[PDB]
């Protein structure tokens, strides 16, 4: 197919966990950035068939989104907050290789990404 199979967001075999900085990632985190108006781009696996992008998954070999990541939160499937975190960072890096400097794609990743920051300066830790 043109389009991969989507990142997964269950995993039987791989050890999980709930705990208070991964409940914070999806209630405060995720839902927060979600909810901005820059997010739409990044709310969906990028589908390549429908954005007549043949050469997206020739660029892009590890894709992530943020619903595939409030999936996971959701399904808890991580062990615990970096993994979480690692993922945003492979979205927004993403972005910046397949895209170019300027472009209105990368400026709203940048924004996203400082965001981000600042709300993960944010995690409890007591
Ligand atoms: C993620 C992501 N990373 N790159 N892209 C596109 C950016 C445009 N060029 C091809 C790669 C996306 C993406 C994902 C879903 C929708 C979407 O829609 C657009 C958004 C803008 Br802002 C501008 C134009 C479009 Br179309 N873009
Ligand atoms: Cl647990
Ligand atoms: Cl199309």
């Known amino acids: 197919s043109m389009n991969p199979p989507p990142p997964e967001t269950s995993n039987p075999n791989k050890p ?6 991964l409940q914070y990632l999806l209630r405060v985190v995720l839902k927060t950035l979600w909810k901005h108006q820059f997010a739409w781009p990044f709310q969906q696996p ?7 992008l043949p050469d997206y998954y020739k660029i892009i070999k590890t894709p992530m989104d ?4 409030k999936k996971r939160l959701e399904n808890n499937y991580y062990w615990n907050a970096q993994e ?6 492979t979205m927004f890096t993403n972005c910046y290789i397949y895209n170019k ?5 990368v400026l709203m990743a940048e924004a996203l990404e400082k965001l981000f920051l600042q709300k993960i ?3 409890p830790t007591e």
Do not use: S, Y
Request: some cysteine; hydrophobic content about 30%; proline content about 3%.
């Open 84 to 89: 979480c975190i690692q993922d945003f960072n």
């Open 101 to 105: 400097p300027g472009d209105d794609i």
């Open 46 to 52: 990028v589908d390549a068939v429908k954005l007549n």
């Open 121 to 123: 300066n944010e995690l």
């Open 16 to 21: 999980k966990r709930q705990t208070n900085q």
């Open 66 to 69: 943020m619903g595939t990541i």
